[PDB]
Design a protein around this ligand. Structure first.
Ligand SMILES: [Mg+2]
Ligand SMILES: [Zn+2]
Ligand SMILES: [Zn+2]
Lengths: 49, 1334, 50, 99, 105, 79, 49
RNA sequence: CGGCACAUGCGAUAUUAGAAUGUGGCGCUCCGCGGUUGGUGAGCAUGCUCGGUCCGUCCGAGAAGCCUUAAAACUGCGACGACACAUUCACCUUGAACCAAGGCGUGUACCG
């Protein structure tokens, strides 16, 4: 429970829903991020990505 | 209060002198009640009381005592701010190496003992031994051992032997060393012996030693014995809301250090075995080294967290250290922030400001006025009155605003117009209204950007913000004399609609008595706004001495021009409003009004221009629509023709006739040709499309299309974007940087299908990513440029020197890129310049050149002017005002005091966002050839034997219209001085063929040319003339490998042909692929070929950094006859033979690469020996300081003028000055310095002028250019060298040296929080400098 | 590499394990040591009378 | 928002930035270069000593303002004193000198 | 391991072989005692005492056991009847056992 | 009102001594040691000081003469 | 990046010789990586990390 | 000319499996009780006397009693807190954990 609550509670991939518009919900659920654990960071990468 | 800041090492006696307690126990606070624990890291008797004037027990609670200490529990009852101030100490049991003197790259214990760092860490981690002055039996001093070798040395030598291990050993090494004995030793080693790179390291070490002894330091202080601790309110443990605390991680670090120190004392009490105490001493070393600077070990992380903790050097060094987060820039009270908006009803000395922000900012002012006027009896009543916002406070607030300037600020404050003052007008609203003409200075659009207001509290700051920073003072840029309050977009559209003419309108060709009935005709609707009309206007002029001579006439003009004429002030002529008035024209209008009538009519004239521009733009109704973008009827026809032509090239590639690359190049050339035809179709379909009639058939004119006015006025966009809206848009490039053969044949008025838009998306996203990254790099470039140049302040009124550089126009290959006039305008002359009739003084020797003087320059025929430059000034510690120039927000000469390094570096780095054959003569004149040496051949032409020839197209007025770098060995048609015509190719060289031309005429022969080895026998299929041609290095045999083929000349008699004029024959050595066409005993003429040899912003941050180029141009050291030495080492020995001096110089050249000079020629010092880029070091070291500053300014002005951004050259010159402050002395002489020592040029200059004024001999120097990230840290003031760059190396380099900082130059004075010795504080520092030590 | 835990392991890795009788032998050396210090006390009369 | 005088940060006596913590528009490094670029020097002296950092100077300024006497008693910034205690709490001796 | 080595040296001080046990069985209790006493002593910013840390470890052990018995998490009202403490002290024991946040978190 | 400070720059040069002179004068008018030598239009002491500069009757030299005159009157008023 | 095997080039930039290198890489989903790469003089090399 | 190693810069400003037991002494605990020196915001808007009066109220000067002193401090008697030492039982048995891998630069040391 500590690991799964640590993931859903604190990660770069798990964030507050932008909820001020139906479009904003439906495009925050449809988002393809390349950041987070197991992915590149803004400092290190990069131009081709 | 105090003077210069001193820094040094800390003795353990000094550390016990600082500290007011020994922290013996690792507790922080008691857990149950949160009183601090005695005597932990947070103590009472060590640091101070918790509450204001109260003991911890409670025996002393009030101001009845302040000197007493409680004898129940020690508390010195004082203020609790004392707890912010007093420091502690820790008695470390075993000693400990200081990590800053151990692990920084120029390691101080490393090259103080002359011992490699891995052996030192091997000693400090108890892996080995080291002898500590162990006599002379078998073992040397620095000779390390191992454990088995230690047993060997102990069983072989029981006594008179000393070798410890660990920090005790390094401390005994540093304590045992006698410094001045080794000083004598290294002086003897630098006198007799010479081991060049090693003795350079050796003289660096002796520099460190005699710098160390000159200080007051001892070496064993580099090992910590007693470690100081920081006060508690700097590492606070304070309650959050909720019973949970925030500790700083320094509490963890000091807790770990105190814990392991207590453990080591406890182990040495119990007499532990050696493995355990060596473990504990390594652990205490790790704990201390993690406290001082965590991150130079295995990065000891904190508890209940994976994140690495924050040590002391983490709190000094970096983006979040005290140098850059809390000293150089502070968060400030009396500030506000809100969204900005336009409000065009303002004069530009005033901005809008909300009532609620004005009430919140000016609260203490309102409090003061209310308790003065007696409406509030006390000040708490004033608080409640301004809290309830009663109706009486708004008159009070209008009294406190009236003449009180506020400071407006946008967050990217690049150049100095980002902070400007205004006078507030109160606004019903919540948005700052910001004057429109000012916004182009801010780079502020109103798309949601928000600005910040600051309030000058004190009286001097009000007078500063009015006298220096009011918006009406800054109407000229500091980058150039151009106006920065240029009317931007709506106003120029209102003008361009107002001053124009259509061939038929109401009131066509009627007569008007003046501008007043022009306005009565337009505003009644009888006559149109624009119709050509004779009016009577009265223009004034400054013909006499500041006198307004009036002349009146009937000008043939339009109605709208006459309506605008009421707004022009008295002084200007009428021709400033008689044209169409785009953006360039209105900038010239404001520039002439400022350069004639001064400041006040230009300010009120800019306000009246803005008002009338917005008003008649409203009356214009200039509106974009969908019919406003006319598509050419010739569009799809040209696209169909190009679609047939690509099918032609497609059939020619399927027929195997062409390859792929020539196909690709032909297709991209025909699509670019189609795009150019579409552009020339759409421009002629827009601009002249309006065709109407007056008293006749028809007549064409410029169009009243909306988008053509918005592109021709220069309001927004140019013809590239109009092209992308109407004609086809360009040729897009794929992520390769390759460019697609199928361009986008659709504009935005037509639709784009999916594939075209998908291709365009890549260019858009690459553009956005590049704008972000270039923003970041431009910020870094601005920061380095200001931090290399804050020390420079205009300090003296005049030095009175004869130095200077030579301003010439910068024409190169094409037409004029920047003329003589707008280069020299604003500078000052060094010597007097003369007419082309000599001995005619046109200016005297040093006068400030203004616009009438440049008029006097242009009415004559002057071409080159000697100018005083700041890089060749004479002044100590600054630049004298009479040498700098004039360019500023004002127009006069620079005042004594004002900082120009900062404005220079800002004006350079501010446009960093915006950054990215034969002779075909164009113009006509006379021909001139400089540094030419040529000979007439048999064919009537002229072949050139000197490659320094510069071709100048001199007209009848002496000036240069074209210049051509003449290649070596060209074929001139005309000679020199003959009047040449346009288009005439005079010199026609072969650019693919390096000439082996001569001066001789006779029989070409072979010398040292052996067949099959140096030369092969080729029999030609095309021409048929079989010959013996020189081969490569792989095929030439071991005999003729070093033996080179040579060509030499005889006459008919067999005697060697000498050059006519000298005695040397022409024996020339050919490389590989040098084709011998003419064989043994074959006659030539004068200069025939003996053979033929066939085949952005980081640029600026490379120039000012002055990085070494990848392929350097090689340059001759001293002038002399060039010759060759030994062959085939990979290099060759380039030997110089001066006539008068001593010759024996030779330089290694990698002989694979193509050279320039032949062996028979002679070179000057600083002349090129090959081509390519050259280092600035070579240009400075050979030619001169004037040449290297000319090289930098011409290269970086090419980089800026490619984008078309004007920067005056003073700024680049003063950055060049701040580059080359350091200079190594060659000959010491009567001075104190050394043969390789690097000291700043101003310090050796004041030393010589004391000695050269005496009869003694001076010290000759070698000027040395350094880059901006290295000339800024090599500084005699270490806070300016520690505020931005690598901090740890600077503090340790200035801590071993005992260096003293005299606050010297605006970085330290921003740091230490006193006045600045540039601006208004210059008079204060001058009064203090007169007072100090006099 | 520095990693001073590993330097501790390599500094103690040279010391080898004990057999089950060598511990008794070391304990008998400890007995001999305390025997000799108590016999050194046994000659000193002032400690006795104290 | 705007701020006359609110709270101050603990470790360095500066007004902490934010909203609605009353903040303060951070007069950062480039704006200090901008005021150096003018002749403004009293503005900068009050901009980074009295309005921001000095623990005595801000209260002296508030008294002088509510008395209607525009005048600053500058003193020394507090965060520079923190920098001295941080370098001094290394092995590095740094001092201020005589007159 | 250094606190364990201090405990081991205390074990070698108080070792008696004539009982017949191996050195391991006797020395393990001294090493664990020194290590547990050290963790209770010096591993916290606010130094909380030995019996207080015993109470905290009892709370974590019993709340580990009850969490798989009940299922949700135990409320301290269940810890009233589960243990022998009057449930108002259990709140302050739960409060004291919190490590302080790093001020650079 | 005072939109541009140009006339005061023409009277007192150097553009930086102007600030110090006007500051000293406006302190002489705010702290009540003196009173203005020009009619005030409900301006603050800043603008009144700059207007006294533009009328020519204040610079650094005249202020120094007036300050030494006040010191001499103090020396005469010691009694 | 998909777990699998990637054959990248990393052209040019090593030691400015003009030669291209080649590096193969086995990227797992959970575990240690694997690399194979050449050098400027035609020698193959392994990396477990 | 290669390799290994290390250092250093940039990567925008701004806004957001322990368990149990005993004994000992201690108190920088503000927790009940006793003794000791030792006060203050009450009568007093004149309790009293005298003088001025604009007054029967306010100003100016005096003396006394009753009543507020465990407040402040000191020292002992209870509670609590922390600390030390000692004992009994049970278990445990000889070399750990750890992250992260995609950018652009500058430089130093060592070896071949
Ligand atoms: Mg914007
Ligand atoms: Zn006390
Ligand atoms: Zn000069």
């Amino acid at each position: 429970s500590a690991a799964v609550k640590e993931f859903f509670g604190s990660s770069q991939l798990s964030q507050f829903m932008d909820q001020n518009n139906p479009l904003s919900e439906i495009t925050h659920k449809r988002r393809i991020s390349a950041l987070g654990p197991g992915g590149l960071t803004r400092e290190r990468a990069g131009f081709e990505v | 209060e105090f003077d210069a800041i001193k820094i040094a090492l800390a003795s353990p006696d000094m550390i016990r002198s600082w500290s007011f307690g020994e922290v013996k126990k690792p507790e922080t606070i008691n857990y149950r009640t949160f009183k601090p624990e005695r005597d932990g890291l947070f103590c009472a008797r060590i640091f101070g009381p918790v509450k204001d004037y109260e003991c911890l027990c409670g025996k002393y609670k009030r101001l009845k005592h302040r000197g007493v200490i409680c004898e129940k529990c020690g508390v010195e009852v004082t203020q609790t701010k004392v707890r912010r101030e007093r420091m502690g100490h820790i008695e470390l049991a075993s000693p400990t190496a200081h990590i800053w003197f151990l692990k920084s790259l120029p390691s101080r214990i490393g090259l103080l003992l002359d011992m490699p760092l891995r052996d030192i860490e091997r000693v400090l981690y108890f892996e080995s031994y080291v002898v500590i002055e162990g006599g002379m039996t078998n073992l040397e001093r620095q000779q390390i051992l191992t454990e088995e070798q230690y047993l060997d040395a102990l069983e072989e030598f029981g006594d008179e032997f000393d070798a410890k291990m660990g920090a005790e050993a390094i401390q005994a090494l540093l304590k045992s060393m006698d410094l001045e004995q080794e000083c004598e030793q290294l002086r003897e080693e630098l006198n007799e012996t010479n081991s060049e790179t090693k003795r350079k390291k050796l003289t660096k070490r002796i520099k460190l030693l005699e710098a160390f002894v000159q200080s007051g330091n001892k070496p064993e202080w580099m090992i910590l014995t007693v470690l100081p601790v920081l006060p508690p309110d700097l590492r606070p443990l304070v309650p959050l809301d909720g019973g949970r605390f925030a500790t700083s991680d320094l509490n963890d670090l000091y807790r770990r250090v105190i814990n392991r120190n207590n453990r080591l004392k406890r182990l040495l009490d119990l007499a532990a075995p050696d493995i355990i105490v060596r473990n504990e001493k390594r652990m205490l070393q790790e704990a201390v080294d993690a406290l001082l600077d965590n991150g130079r070990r295995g990065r000891a992380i904190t508890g209940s967290n994976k994140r690495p903790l924050k040590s002391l050097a983490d709190m000094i060094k970096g983006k979040q250290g005290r140098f850059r987060q809390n000293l150089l820039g502070k968060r400030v009270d009396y500030s506000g922030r809100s969204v900005i908006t336009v409000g065009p009803y303002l004069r530009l000395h005033q901005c809008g400001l909300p009532k609620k922000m004005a009430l919140e900012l000016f609260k203490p002012f309102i409090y003061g006025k209310l308790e003065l006027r007696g409406l509030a009896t006390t000040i708490k009543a004033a608080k409640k009155m301004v809290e309830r916002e009663e109706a009486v406070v708004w008159d009070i607030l209008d009294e406190v605003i009236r003449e009180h300037p506020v400071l407006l600020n946008r967050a990217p404050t690049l150049h100095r117009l980002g902070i400007q003052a205004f006078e507030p007008v109160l606004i019903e609203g919540k948005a700052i209204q910001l004057h429109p003409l000012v916004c182009a200075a801010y780079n502020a659009d109103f798309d949601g950007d928000q600005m910040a207001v600051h309030v000058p509290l004190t009286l001097e700051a009000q007078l500063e913000a009015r006298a220096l920073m009011m918006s009406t003072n800054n109407i000229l840029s500091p980058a150039n004399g151009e106006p920065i309050i240029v009317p931007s977009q709506d106003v120029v559209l209102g003008l361009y609609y107002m001053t124009r003419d259509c061939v038929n309108a109401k009131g066509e060709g009627m007569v008007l008595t003046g501008p007043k009935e022009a306005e009565r005709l337009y505003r009644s609707g009888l006559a149109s706004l624009h119709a050509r009309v004779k009016v009577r206007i009265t223009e004034y002029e400054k013909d006499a001495n500041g006198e307004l001579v009036a002349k009146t006439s009937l000008k043939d003009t339009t109605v709208g021009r006459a309506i605008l004429w009421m707004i022009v002030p008295k002084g200007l002529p009428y021709s400033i409003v008689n044209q169409a008035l785009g953006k360039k024209a209105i900038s010239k209008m404001l520039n002439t009004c400022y350069r004639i009538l001064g400041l006040k009519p230009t300010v009120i004239f800019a306000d009246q221009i803005m008002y009338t521009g917005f008003a008649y733009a409203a009356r214009s109704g200039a509106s974009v629509g969908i019919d406003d973008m006319v598509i050419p009827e010739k569009k799809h026809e040209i696209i169909s023709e190009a679609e047939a032509e690509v099918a032609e090239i497609q059939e020619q590639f399927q027929s195997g006739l062409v390859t792929a690359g020539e196909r690709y190049n032909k297709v991209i050339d025909i699509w670019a040709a189609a795009n150019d035809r579409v552009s020339k179709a759409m421009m002629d379909n827009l601009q002249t499309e309006t065709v109407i009639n007056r008293d006749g058939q028809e007549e064409k004119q410029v169009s009243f299309n909306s988008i053509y006015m918005m592109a021709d006025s220069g309001a927004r966009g140019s013809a590239a974007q109009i092209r992308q809206l109407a004609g086809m848009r360009g040729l897009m490039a794929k992520p390769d940087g390759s460019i697609i053969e199928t361009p986008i044949t659709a504009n935005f008025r037509e639709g784009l299908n999916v594939l075209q838009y998908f291709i365009s998306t890549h260019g858009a996203r690459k553009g956005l990513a590049d704008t972000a990254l270039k923003t970041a790099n431009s910020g870094y470039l601005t920061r380095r440029l200001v931090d290399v140049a804050q020390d420079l302040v205009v300090t003296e009124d005049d030095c009175g020197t004869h130095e200077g550089i030579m301003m010439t126009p910068v024409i190169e290959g094409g037409d004029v890129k920047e003329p003589l006039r707008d280069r020299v305008l604003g500078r000052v002359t060094a010597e007097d310049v003369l007419k082309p009739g000599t001995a005619d003084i046109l200016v005297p020797r040093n006068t400030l050149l203004h616009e009438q003087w440049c008029d006097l320059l242009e009415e004559n025929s002057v071409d080159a002017v000697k100018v005083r430059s700041v890089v060749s000034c004479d002044t100590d510690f600054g630049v004298c005002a009479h040498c700098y120039g004039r360019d500023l927000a004002r127009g006069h000469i620079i005042n004594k005091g004002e900082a120009i390094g900062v404005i220079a570096a800002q004006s350079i780095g501010e446009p960093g966002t915006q950054l990215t054959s034969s002779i075909q003569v164009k113009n006509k004149g006379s021909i001139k050839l400089s540094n030419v040496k040529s000979v007439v051949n048999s064919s009537g032409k002229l072949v050139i034997t000197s490659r320094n020839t510069e071709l100048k197209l001199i007209d009848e007025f002496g000036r240069t219209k074209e210049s051509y770098k003449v290649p070596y060995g060209a074929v001139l048609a005309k000679g020199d001085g003959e009047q040449v015509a346009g288009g005439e190719t005079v010199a026609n060289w072969d650019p693919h063929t390096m000439p082996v031309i001569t001066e001789v005429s006779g029989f070409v022969r072979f010398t040292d040319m052996i067949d099959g080895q140096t030369i092969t026998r080729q029999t030609d299929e095309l021409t048929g003339l079989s010959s013996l041609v020189v081969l490569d290095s792989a095929e030439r045999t071991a005999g003729g490998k070093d033996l080179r083929p040579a060509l030499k000349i005889v006459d008919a008699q067999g005697n060697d042909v000498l050059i006519p004029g000298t005695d040397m024959p022409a024996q020339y050595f050919l490389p590989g692929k040098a084709i011998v066409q003419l064989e043994d005993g074959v006659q030539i003429s004068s200069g025939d070929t003996l053979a033929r040899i066939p085949q952005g912003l980081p640029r600026v941050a490379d120039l000012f950094e002055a990085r070494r180029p990848k392929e350097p141009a090689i340059l001759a050291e001293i002038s002399g006859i060039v010759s060759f030495g030994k062959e085939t080492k990979g290099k060759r020995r380039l030997v110089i033979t001066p006539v008068d001096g001593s010759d024996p110089y030779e330089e290694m050249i990698p002989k694979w690469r193509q050279l320039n000079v032949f062996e028979g020629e002679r070179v000057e010092r600083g002349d090129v020996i090959s081509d390519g880029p050259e280092a600035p070091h070579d240009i400075l070291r050979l030619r001169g300081v004037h040449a290297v500053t000319r090289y930098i300014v011409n290269e970086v002005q090419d980089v800026y003028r490619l984008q078309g951004v004007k920067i005056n050259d003073k700024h680049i010159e003063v950055i060049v000055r701040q580059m080359l402050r350091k200079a190594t002395i060659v000959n010491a002489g009567s001075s104190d310095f050394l043969e390789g020592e690097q000291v700043e040029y101003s310090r050796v200059k004041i030393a010589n002028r004391e000695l050269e004024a005496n009869g003694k001999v001076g010290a000759t120097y070698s000027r040395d250019l350094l880059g901006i990230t290295k000339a800024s840290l090599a500084t005699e003031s270490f806070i300016s060298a520690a505020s931005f760059q690598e901090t740890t190396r600077v503090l340790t380099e200035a801590a071993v040296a005992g260096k003293r900082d005299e606050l010297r130059g605006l970085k330290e004075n921003v740091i230490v929080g006193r006045l600045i010795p540039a601006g208004t504080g210059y008079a204060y520092h001058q009064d203090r400098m007169r007072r100090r030590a006099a | 590499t520095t990693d001073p835990v590993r330097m501790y392991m390599r500094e103690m890795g040279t010391v080898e394990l004990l057999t089950r009788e060598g511990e008794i032998d070391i304990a008998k050396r400890i007995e001999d040591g305390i025997n000799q210090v108590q016999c050194s006390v046994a000659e000193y009369p002032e400690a006795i009378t104290y | 928002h705007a701020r006359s005088t609110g709270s101050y940060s603990l470790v360095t006596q500066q007004p902490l930035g934010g909203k609605a913590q009353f903040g303060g528009q951070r007069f950062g490094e480039m704006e200090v270069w901008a005021l150096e670029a003018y002749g403004a020097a009293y503005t900068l002296q009050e901009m980074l000593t009295v309005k921001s950092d000095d623990v005595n100077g801000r209260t002296k300024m508030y008294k002088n303002i509510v008395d209607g006497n525009h005048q600053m008693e500058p003193g020394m910034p507090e965060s520079f004193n923190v920098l001295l205690k941080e370098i001094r709490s290394l092995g590095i001796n740094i001092e201020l000198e005589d007159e | 391991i250094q606190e364990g080595n201090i405990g081991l040296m205390k074990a070698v001080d108080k070792f008696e072989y004539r009982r017949g046990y191996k050195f391991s069985t006797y020395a393990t209790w001294w090493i664990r005692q020194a290590i547990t006493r050290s963790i209770a002593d010096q591993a916290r910013t606010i130094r909380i005492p030995v019996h207080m840390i015993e109470t905290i470890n009892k709370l974590n052990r019993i709340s580990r056991q009850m969490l798989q018995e009940m299922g949700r998490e135990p409320t301290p009202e269940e810890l009233a009847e589960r243990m022998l403490m009057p449930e108002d002290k259990i709140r302050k024991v739960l409060k004291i056992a919190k490590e302080p946040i790093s001020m650079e978190t | 009102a005072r939109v541009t400070v140009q006339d005061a720059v023409e009277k007192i040069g150097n553009r930086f001594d102007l600030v110090l002179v006007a500051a000293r004068r406006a302190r002489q008018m705010q702290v009540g040691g003196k009173d203005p030598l020009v009619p005030e239009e409900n301006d603050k002491t800043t603008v009144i000081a700059l207007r006294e500069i533009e009328e020519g009757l204040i610079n650094n030299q005249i202020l120094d003469v007036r300050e030494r005159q006040e010191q001499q009157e103090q020396e005469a008023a010691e009694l | 990046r998909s777990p699998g095997v990637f054959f990248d080039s990393d052209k040019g930039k090593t030691h400015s010789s003009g030669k291209v290198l080649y590096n193969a890489r086995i990227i797992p989903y959970r575990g240690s990586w694997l690399d194979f790469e050449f050098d400027p003089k035609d020698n193959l090399f392994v990396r477990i990390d």
